[PDB]
Amino acid sequence: KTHVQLSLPVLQVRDVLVRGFGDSVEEVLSEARQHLKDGTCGLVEVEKGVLPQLEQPYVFIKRSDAAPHGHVMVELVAELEGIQYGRSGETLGVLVPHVGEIPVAYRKVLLRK
């Protein structure tokens, strides 16, 4: 399927144990997609002071369209030293590995895979 319904655990930035997916734009997009498939991906909502507490390159989920079954359609965009790889809509948050942190909420998304 071109899209997959996921419910992403929303994590507090200070709880996150593994603060990124790797060391290159290509690696972080690869790892993010693998963790999204394996159900081991968390979401941090972006506010003032969040991104400096996480590791670059960043992987964002961005709104790809204006929401089937409650699921916002999203795609992945990476960012390294102020350059984004991909073009999409509004940021819903930054993806991180989930290793058992307790979420504050869930974000229903339809991921363009």
Tell me the residue ranges of DSSP E strands in the chain. 3-10, 41-44, 58-63, 72-80, 83-85, 91-97, 105-112
β-pairing, 83-85 with 72-80? antiparallel
Q: Return d(Cα 94, Cα 10) in angstroms, integer.
A: 10
Contact assessment for residue 54 and residue 20, using Cβ atoms and an 8 Å cutoff: yes
Q: Return d(Cα 91, Cα 39) in angstroms, integer.
A: 20
Resolution (angstroms) equals 1.7
| Distance in Å from the first CA to the final CA of the chain | 8
Domains defined for the chain, CATH in brackets: 3-112 (2.30.30)
Backbone angles phi, psi at 79, to 5 degrees: -140, 130
Which experimental technique did the depositors report for determining this structure? X-ray
